[PDB]
């Protein structure tokens, strides 16, 4: 059974059961500290009370977000989502995302929408994100370019292995102003994503 | 300008070009007669030239010590005195000067500088005094006075958790009273962070107080009217249970559940409350289902209800749960928690009623882990190995559950045969070749190779784990334990790239924490600070952090590399630990990644003897390292003398064998005899070291004993203090055989594996290997890596 | 309307319209103080006399230099 | 050893100790018969014992003056001779001993001590000579010989900037040629600081030469390949314009913009160059937009392009600027600069087209400050006052401008009624409570309370401005002007804490400046040295410094305090001003903080009449203090006779009435009549002082007139030279009369303030307060403040 707990700074010692996943990024030590310092309340971990913390890490995942923009563009951004291998395909990943919605639709945040960037090739995440009511707002060409790839010079060449989808869920307060059915046709450069 | 001199004076000091320094400082002293900074500089240059010739008491203690009357408000003078006193191990004097400086010249800057300096030193007491001084002079500060009272409370909070041994019983109550009152005077609280710290102050510094629990519940419940905070969730649940109020516990859980918080902790406390409120079982079940619907918790809530209301799980609640979860990997964990209340035959009947099409791989894995059927991991794997080709390349196969079951069973043996170790390796590799991202089998492959000392193939495996950042603290122990005597190859990517990159956590990130620590206080992120406080203390004391440095000192010794720089950090790291006023080590190694009972496995499984390291073994290795530095001078140090008294008050020789290998123990005793006894008994001690058998059956001990022998004898041969002829006769003669044997051992080790392969092909091993539908791998590839290891040894 | 003025320590509160720029480095307070101590005359700001200081921040840019 | 001997002689010398001084000096001269130092000390002890008995010519001028044959190289003898000649007002002789010493006993040390002394005395001519001797003996120095030629060039620039009156035309030409030639011989230059000094020598000492401008452009342009320097930016722009080369100006501006310098001075000079090169407007616009992107400067560049190419700003460029800036505070400032080229109806049309939601508070402030609509400040304040509750506490309020328009209009009247001033205070106090950090409204509150003589209420606002360091020189005039006669309370934090702490700039920081300038020379920070010399000169000459010193002497007379140290400091500060060879005062007061047209406001606004002080008023007050000091001896001093000859050649009474208040003028004439005429007309002058009216309509002049009479009469009653019994009886009767009327004067003023209050609740004042939703506070606070002043005044 999953209980949702604050992520404590020392829990990074207890996240190996989460972070050896080939797709989960172990961010620099500086990066984890930043999120707790500016936005402490949205940085939480999923804990299994079924797993004894004396013997094993009970952390099944954690959520990293930021709030950004102003006025109409004031939103919460889903930066990273991970779930321990033992606890996949049991809708825990949905629960964390829903847990943001209750947490960000109310005071003090009252965000207009939640957005996230997902690789265009990530059909597994895409179908997950669609199913909760998120919609693609635009395709971000070259969002994940390496220094060797350089800056994308044209919006005409698209690569599902290199482009990211700007994926959005509009809140009730937004009245769907920040979402669109045809966003998969809209393309922008990484520098045009500004808030 | 203050800075520009300091490097130049120290850079002249560091080159021992002392003579000009006094002229230049004297030139400064004629220009700046009143700058105490330069008078402190004169002492620092003085001490470095001839420590035993300059009276520490006369020049430092009376002006600057705990009774020092010479007080300065110049931050640079205070900082330089602090760093000097720390360098002398005078940690109380180091921060005392700031308290006196701030006492005589109180200012926001100086109060801030003092707080920052105390923060670096882990002196949780001194922040509390420093925090109060900022509050009085906050009018020139950039944060509201209210912040500094929370800073004091957090400093008081910090002391009680990590430095309680520093507080006398009267002082604790005083600090406890001071913390609460200063936060009371700031009510109403402005934000959730302030509420948490007040709740934190109350909960830990006033435990078991009835009024305290009532106050925390009242303030926390009122906040839940508008906002949802998980810390207040934790606070309210604890104290409402302490209040033994079933009515309030139901109200709290209901209010939080209705807000959409699917929490089993909420559900259980809701469930616990309702029974004491005599609510009907059906009423609670419907209410949970109505507000939460079908979730993992709510189906399991029916099981918890069945136990709480009838002491047995009913078939209906279990089947409803199982209807969706029987073929989910979490199923076994969920039901094992309830094993004590679930009839196994009833569970067995339901699991057998599912269709053969629904009895998928995961369903059988749950059957296996629940012990409902005898172990059939061989047939189950063969039934389900066909899933390996259809699953996502990035997806983990549950087939490892069956193969690891075989692997653990062989590995539970107290003394695995050389064939037995290779048998697991052969099984796992073909599976890892099919499941390249499965870490569970991968770690065992990693673990198995290190026990055989075949480091390069395991390192071939380690690089694919992409271990980085915090994982280096918890996971590097598999390969960086005792590296100096397992794989002494300075040119290998293992050391030059992997080991070097993994040190960035301790050399850069650890150093950087205070600047991040500072901002959290300024950013009022108090709720994370106390957990953020914890990381550093563990990180200095981290088993991995200390082990790697000490092994590197031996490795740098074995390779005849320069150690002057290496020791200085060790002394700096030692000083950094000592200022914390609690000398201990922190075991952060994640043994749970390999097995659930691994705490039971470590003490019994020779497979991890190479990684079996405790505080005592870590402390002993340090003392050996510290000795080596003193050996060229030949004087006994107070530092070593104080540490040796901290070792358990038993006869030395037993303690070593209980925490170090026989060859390490024999080496360890040798170094004392020159240090303690001026080396009378080396003739017998060297002979004992040489007698330690190097046999082909010792696996990792083959390399370990050889290189520990090599490292010791080379150090002694380098030791210019050994003048006695006949001891020197043995030392060079002893080395002479050691170089000669270098190849005799390896061929016998190389010989031994090949017969084990022949053993594997035949009898129980081969027949399972035919049964496994897996064919033994090629010996030569293993031989080359060993013969690569053998090649490395000769070039030593 | 640009005037060139000495950079004062308290101007660090009034530089966000300059220093939220993705290419502009926000140094530690100690580093700004080092430049103010050693080269007080070579740390200066451009201020816009068109912008009422009370209404919003009138700092349009700054220079940090040293002699060596 | 020497310094203890000097201290004991001079220590004795404060008392004087003539007999013990001579006994000790006689022993020291027997021990050290060749030490000139002890003979000079004996001459000083003689002079201090009986100045008029010792022949200055025989004992000092003939041995050590400008024709002196007694020359020493002992640094202590030279320093003591210098300090002795300075004490005698013999400033030419003071540095001549070092010049002669260095000619006879040339050394690096003696040349360096001479350069340092010449820097302390502000004698830039002697610094120039000493720097050439440092260059000559540089082999024993710590700096390369080249540095001392830059020190010589900077010394010549300092003479040319600050002491040009000390140079004959042939000497100016000679020094300019010497400076240029000495730096030419040092090419290639080693760093940008040397290039800056070379460009300064060329630009300032050789004005209007084409060849000089070509040389400066060549050297600066080449540096911009590798570095970006803001001094070189200014030189290249100045001299490329002087060369009238549009092509070269375009290349320079383009290269610096391409380096990433968004600078409006570069952009304007680029546009002016491009226009002269016949480049199209669209080419220049496109090039700016491509190289700099969207900034305040590039949007304003479109207005400058319209003016340069079409003489008028287009609707398209104006609408493009306004689209981002119409609601930015800088907008009115930016457009007012172009007011001669902007059609007002077009601007009003664009400003009216924005949506009602985008027409924020700022936008309405900009409309008002641009004069586009009639003043509607009451309705605009009422529309936006709800923004005061929503702003950050630390952000300054937008609506204040509307209230400051109303206050400025009321205060522009040549004689504001007491009700109009109390109306302005009532509006501003009610606003300041909602915008507590708004320094514009706080500065107006301070000045309005000071105009009422309500110094405690002014002080309450002034402490919240947190004025410190250099701001004390430019802002203290708001509250410390005439402080000895506005609020003579020594026990108040105003005097004991605020005034005393604010003097640390002149007493500590100013005294340390020569040292910092020396370190600037040694560190090659040459670009700042001339500005540091100017900063020192401005602080030495500061109106605020001199006014505070003179007012503190008057305050110390009024309180019957000891003045000996203050008079000693006045004489030391006066000698330091005479050593500059340009005796003048520097007005550093920042009047622009209250209004932009403040200079017009000083001449017309009675509101700052209490702070109306000019160079003549400071100089007359200085002469009065020196007269008062000379009165007890009854001798005319050459110093006062020299100062009186520097006054304008008009009638003394006309000069006093033009620069001082009527009571200050009457006080001056009283002390002057005792000094010049032995008090022959003192009866009529005391009678005239007593006739100066103290009326309730005089505001701050109530306390000022009372206390100036009190200070005058107390000074006279203490003066033992007044032997006439009728005059002594007059002084005592006038003191008794003045003490007896104190209560009726302050009660009369209190009644006038109360009446003006009650008038605020009526007619136009009452309607305006109701329209603003401003409560007329309680007159009780005013009454209590005035009663506190009355108690302080009555106790004297």
UniProtKB/Swiss-Prot annotation, chains B, D:
The modification N-acetylserine is found at residue 2. Keywords: Acetylation, Cytoplasm. Transmembrane segments: none annotated. The keyword Acetylation applies. InterPro entries: NAA25_NatB_aux_su (IPR019183). GO terms for biological process: cytoskeleton organization; mitochondrion inheritance; regulation of actin cytoskeleton organization. Pfam families: NatB_MDM20. The keyword Hydrolase does not apply. It is found in: Cytoplasm. GO terms for cellular component: cytoplasm; NatB complex. It comes from the Eukaryota. GO terms for molecular function: acetyltransferase activator activity. Present with 5800 molecules/cell in log phase SD medium. Belongs to the MDM20/NAA25 family. Non-catalytic subunit of the NatB N-terminal acetyltransferase, which catalyzes acetylation of the amino-terminal methionine residues of all proteins beginning with Met-Asp or Met-Glu and of some proteins beginning with Met-Asn or Met-Met. NatB acetylates TPM1 protein and regulates tropomyocin-actin interactions. MDM20 is required for mitochondrial inheritance during budding and together with TPM1, is essential for the integrity and assembly of actin cables. Genetically interacts with CIN8. Component of the N-terminal acetyltransferase B (NatB) complex, which is composed of NAT3 and MDM20. PANTHER family: N-ALPHA-ACETYLTRANSFERASE 25, NATB AUXILIARY SUBUNIT, N-TERMINAL ACETYLTRANSFERASE-RELATED. This is N-terminal acetyltransferase B complex subunit MDM20. It comes from Saccharomyces cerevisiae (strain ATCC 204508 / S288c).
Swiss-Prot record, chain C:
It is found in: Cytoplasm. The keyword Electron transport does not apply. GO terms for cellular component: cytoplasm; NatB complex. Keywords: Acyltransferase, Cytoplasm, Transferase. One of its GO terms (molecular function) is protein-N-terminal amino-acid acetyltransferase activity. Present with 639 molecules/cell in log phase SD medium. Catalytic subunit of the NatB N-terminal acetyltransferase, which catalyzes acetylation of the amino-terminal methionine residues of all proteins beginning with Met-Asp or Met-Glu and of some proteins beginning with Met-Asn, Met-Gln or Met-Met. NatB acetylates TPM1 protein and regulates tropomyocin-actin interactions, it is presumed to N-acetylate 15% of all yeast proteins. This is N-terminal acetyltransferase B complex catalytic subunit NAT3.
């Amino acid at each position: 059974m999953t209980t949702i707990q604050p992520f404590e700074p020392v829990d990074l010692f207890k996240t190996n059961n989460v972070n050896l996943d080939i797709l989960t990024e172990n961010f620099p030590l500086e990066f984890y500290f930043e999120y707790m310092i500016i936005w402490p309340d949205l940085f939480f971990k999923s804990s299994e009370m079924t797993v004894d913390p004396t013997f094993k890490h009970n952390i099944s995942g954690y959520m990293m977000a930021k709030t950004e923009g102003k006025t109409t563009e004031w939103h919460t951004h889903i930066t990273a989502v991970t779930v321990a291998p033992r606890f996949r395909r049991i809708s825990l990943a949905s629960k964390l995302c829903n847990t943001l919605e209750t947490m960000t639709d109310v005071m003090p945040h009252e965000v207009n929408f939640i957005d996230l960037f997902v690789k265009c090739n990530n059909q597994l995440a895409i179908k997950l994100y669609e199913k909760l009511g998120y919609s693609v707002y635009r395709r971000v060409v070259g969002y994940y370019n390496s220094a060797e790839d350089g800056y994308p010079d044209t919006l005409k060449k698209v690569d599902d292995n290199k482009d990211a989808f700007d994926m959005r869920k509009a809140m009730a307060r937004d009245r769907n102003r920040s979402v669109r059915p045809d966003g998969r046709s809209h393309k922008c450069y990484p520098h045009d994503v500004r808030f | 300008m203050s800075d520009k001199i300091q490097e130049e004076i120290l850079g002249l000091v560091s080159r021992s070009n002392f003579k000009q320094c006094y002229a230049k400082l004297g030139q400064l002293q004629k220009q700046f007669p009143n700058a105490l900074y330069f008078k402190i500089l004169e002492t620092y240059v003085k001490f470095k030239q001839s420590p035993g010739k300059f009276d520490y008491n006369k020049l430092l203690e009376e002006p600057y010590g705990l009774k020092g009357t010479t007080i300065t408000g110049d931050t640079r003078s205070l900082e330089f005195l602090h760093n000097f006193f720390v360098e002398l191990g005078k940690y109380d004097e180091a921060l005392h000067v700031y308290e006196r400086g701030n006492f005589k010249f109180p200012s926001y800057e100086l109060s801030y500088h003092w707080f920052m300096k105390a923060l670096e030193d882990s002196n949780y007491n001194q922040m509390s005094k420093a925090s109060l001084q900022l509050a009085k002079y906050s009018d020139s500060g950039n944060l509201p006075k209210r912040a500094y009272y929370f800073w004091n409370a957090i400093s008081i909070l910090a002391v009680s958790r990590f430095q309680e041994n520093t507080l006398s019983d009267p002082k604790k109550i005083l600090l406890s009273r001071l913390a609460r009152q200063s936060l009371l005077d700031l009510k109403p609280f402005q934000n959730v962070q302030e509420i948490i710290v007040y709740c934190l102050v109350l909960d830990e510094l006033f435990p078991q107080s009835r009024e305290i629990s009532e106050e925390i519940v009242a303030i926390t419940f009122a906040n839940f009217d508008t906002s949802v905070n998980l810390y207040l969730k934790n606070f309210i649940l604890k104290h409402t249970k302490l209040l033994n109020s079933p009515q309030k516990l139901f109200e709290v859980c209901s209010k939080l559940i209705e807000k959409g918080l699917d929490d089993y902790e909420l559900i259980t406390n809701l469930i616990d409350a309702a029974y004491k409120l005599s609510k009907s079982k059906d009423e609670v079940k419907q209410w949970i289902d109505e507000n939460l619907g079908d979730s993992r918790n709510t189906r399991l809530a029916r099981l918890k209800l069945d136990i709480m209301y009838t002491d047995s799980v009913s078939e209906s609640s279990l089947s409803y749960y199982l209807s969706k979860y029987h073929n989910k990997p979490c199923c076994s964990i969920d039901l094992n928690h309830y094993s004590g209340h679930i009839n196994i035959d009833m569970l067995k009947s339901i699991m057998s009623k599912y269709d053969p099409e629904d009895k998928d791989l995961i369903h059988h894995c749950n059957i296996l882990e629940l012990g409902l059927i005898g172990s059939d991991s061989i047939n189950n794997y063969n039934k389900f190995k066909g899933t390996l080709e259809k699953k996502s390349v990035t997806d983990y196969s549950s087939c490892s559950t069956f193969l690891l079951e075989i692997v653990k069973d062989k590995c539970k043996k107290t003394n695995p045969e050389l064939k037995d170790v290779l048998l697991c390796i052969t099984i796992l590799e073909n599976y890892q070749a099919k499941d390249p991202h499965n870490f569970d089998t991968m770690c065992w492959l990693i673990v198995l190779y290190m026990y055989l000392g075949l480091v390069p193939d395991a390192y071939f495996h380690f690089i694919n784990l992409k271990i980085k950042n915090v994982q280096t603290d918890s996971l590097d122990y598999m390969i960086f334990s005792r590296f100096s005597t397992l794989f002494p190859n300075k040119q290998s990517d293992f050391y030059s790239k992997t080991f070097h990159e993994h040190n960035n956590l301790y050399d850069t990130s650890l150093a950087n924490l205070p600047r991040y620590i500072q901002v959290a206080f300024e950013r009022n992120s108090y709720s994370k600070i106390l957990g953020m406080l914890e990381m550093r203390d563990k990180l200095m004391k981290s088993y991995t952090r200390w082990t790697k440095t000490l092994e590197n000192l031996q490795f740098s010794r074995l390779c005849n590399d320069k150690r002057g720089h290496l020791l200085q950090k060790l002394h700096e790291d030692w000083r950094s630990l000592e200022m914390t006023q609690s000398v201990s080590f922190s075991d952060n190694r994640d043994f749970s990644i390999l097995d659930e009972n691994f705490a039971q496995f470590l003490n019994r499984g020779k497979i991890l003897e190479y990684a079996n390291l405790n505080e005592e073994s870590i402390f002993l290795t340090l003392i050996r390292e510290l000795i080596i530095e003193a050996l060229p001078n030949g004087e006994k140090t107070e530092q070593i003398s104080a540490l040796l008294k901290k070792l358990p008050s038993i006869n030395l020789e037993e303690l070593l064998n209980n925490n170090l290998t026989e060859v390490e123990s024999a080496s360890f005793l040798i170094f004392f005899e020159i240090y303690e006894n001026n080396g009378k008994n080396l003739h017998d001690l060297i002979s004992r070291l040489m007698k330690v058998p190097i046999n082909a059956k010792q696996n990792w001990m083959v390399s370990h004993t050889y290189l520990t022998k090599m490292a010791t004898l080379k150090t002694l041969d380098s030791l210019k203090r050994i003048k006695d002829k006949e001891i020197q006769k043995l030392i060079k003669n002893s080395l002479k055989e050691l170089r000669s044997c270098c190849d005799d051992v390896f061929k016998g080790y190389s010989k031994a594996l090949v017969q084990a392969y022949e053993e594997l092909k035949k009898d129980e091993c081969g027949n399972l290997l035919k049964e496994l539908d897996v064919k033994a791998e090629n010996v030569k590839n293993i031989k080359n890596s060993l013969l690569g290891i053998q090649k490395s040894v000769r070039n030593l």
